[PDB]
Structure formats: C-alpha cells, structure tokens
C-alpha cells in the first residue's frame, strides 16, 4: 500500500468468516472446521471470533445433523461496518487541525464499510469469479 | 472508536511537524527544538523524521544564523497524502471479495488525503481557532 494501510487479522478473518457464512446461507448450517478449511484460517482463532459474533447476534448455532453455524440475519441486513463495529472495542483545549484530518479519514472509511453489505459481496463474488463464452467479454 | 482506525506515530508526527512548518513558512526558518516544543514531540524522533522529509525534498535546511528548517515547497503544493507516501515503505489465483473491500477502503483514504493540502490545513486552522464578536456566530 502507498498510504500504508494495514488491516488487522481480526478484521480480515471476521469478514472472511462472515462472507463464507453468507455464501452458504441458503444451503444451511456449516461447521467451523469447514469455514477454516475453505478460508485458510486457524480453527482456534475462528472459534474465538465466532463466539463474539454469536453474542452480537450476527451468527447463530444450530443443533442439527448438519448442525453448525449460520448467519443470524440475512446478508442484505449485515453491513461490513456492522461486523467491524462488533469486533472493535492540568486540562486544556487546543484544537488540532491534524487530528481533524484523521477524523475525515475515519469518516470516509466508515462510509465505505457501511455502503457494502454481505449481499453486495455475494453479488460481486458471482460476477468476478464466473466463466462465460469469450465473445461476451466486452 | 467505531471502526477502530489507529494512526501511526509516524503519520501523526510527520503531519504535525509539516503543518508546524507550514504555519511558519512566511516568517522563515525555525529550529527543530521549537517544533518539538510547540507540538509536544520528542526531539530525537523528530530529527529522524525530518531527515527523511529532507531527503524527499519536502523540507530544507538553511544555514542562516537564526536558521533552521523550512518547507521546500509551498503549502498549496504539498498534499497530506504526499507526506504519508514519503514516510511509508505452489502458486494459484483465487479472487478474494474480502480483499476487494479493503482495496475500496484504501482508495477512499487515498482520496481524502490527496484532497487536503497544507494550505487547506492553514485555512482551516485560521477559521476554527478564531475569536470574534459573539453576534457574528
């Protein structure tokens, strides 16, 4: 990155795991092991992640044969920013214009992540990894 | 915070120091000690910072007597993004939609930081830290 943005492991794995659940939402519950396998995630880390997402009401556990985990809301009702919000935790006043610049950076990030839902990601996933007859590439 | 964005020490101090130089551009060179004092920065850290900014052509040293450091370009020709860029430094393909989301985040940050110059910051500084008759609020 030119601006040197670094994404935390928790953000990256949180979104990856939620997206994997979105990809399986219609078909039903999947095991955590299967998510870890498809996404190249460590199972212990994923276990801890899912625990928080579950407390937040973003994912739920089911007791079936195909038991396992499913999204607790439809992908269209989960913004990427919602996932990030869940995972994240002598005096005098002197205004800092520099801090105001960072506030503007923060606001723009919040705007992007609130503008994308898991359903949007599902749509993009379909368009970008598809295959077609060559004459249809424009 | 909300998204939990954290700004590095180097970005924060890099921009603070460059802005302090912008605030003194017309008046001329200032010492690094003076910058460290006004901005609450560690002198050793600032000296290392300034060395890179100098190599990049963003600041220059002047011999003088009351010499010191000044911006090497006018504040209107230095984007905050320019400062950040200076300071920063088998096989198979599988598209990641999650990575594409972060690419979009990166783009928007780049756009904000390229849209603000040190001159814009000088104007904002004036406006926000002013004093006037109360009837004009």
């Amino acid at each position: 990155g030119a601006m040197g943005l670094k994404v935390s492991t928790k953000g990256h794995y949180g979104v990856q795991a939620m997206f994997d659940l979105a990809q399986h939402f219609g078909e039903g519950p999947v095991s955590l092991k299967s998510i870890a396998e498809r996404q190249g995630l460590s199972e212990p880390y994923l276990e801890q992640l899912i625990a928080v997402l579950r407390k937040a009401g973003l994912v739920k556990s089911v007791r079936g044969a195909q038991g396992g985990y499913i999204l607790a809301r439809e992908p269209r009702d989960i913004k990427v920013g919602d996932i990030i919000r869940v995972l994240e935790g002598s005096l005098k006043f002197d205004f800092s214009v520099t801090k105001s610049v960072w506030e503007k950076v923060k606001k723009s990030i919040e705007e992007v992540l609130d503008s994308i839902t898991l359903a949007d990601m599902l749509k993009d996933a379909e368009e970008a990894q598809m295959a077609q007859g060559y004459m249809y590439y424009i | 915070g909300a998204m939990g964005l954290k700004v590095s020490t180097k970005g924060h101090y890099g921009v603070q120091a460059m802005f302090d130089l912008a605030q003194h551009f017309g008046e001329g060179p200032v010492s690094l000690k003076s910058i460290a004092e006004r901005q609450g920065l560690s002198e050793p850290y600032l000296e290392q910072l300034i060395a890179v900014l100098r190599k990049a052509g963003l600041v220059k040293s002047v011999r003088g007597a009351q010499g010191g450091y000044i911006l090497a370009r006018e504040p209107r020709d230095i984007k905050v993004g320019d400062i950040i860029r200076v300071l920063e430094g088998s096989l198979k393909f599988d598209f990641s939609v999650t990575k594409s989301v972060w690419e979009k985040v990166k783009k928007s940050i780049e756009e904000v930081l390229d849209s603000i110059t040190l001159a814009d910051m000088l104007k904002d500084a004036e406006e926000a830290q002013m004093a006037q008759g109360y009837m004009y609020y």
């Binding site: 990155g1 601006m3 040197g4 943005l5 670094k6 994404v7 935390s8 928790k10 953000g11 990030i84 995972l87 994240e88 950076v105 990030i109 | 998204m3 939990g4 964005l5 954290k6 700004v7 590095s8 180097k10 970005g11 950040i84 300071l87 920063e88 985040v105 940050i109």
Partner: peptide, 6 residues
C-alpha cells in the same frame, strides 16, 4: 486496532 495507517 482494526486498521492502521501507515
């Protein structure tokens, strides 16, 4: 600590 710059 979700994202940092730079």
């Amino acid at each position: 600590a979700a994202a940092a710059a730079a």
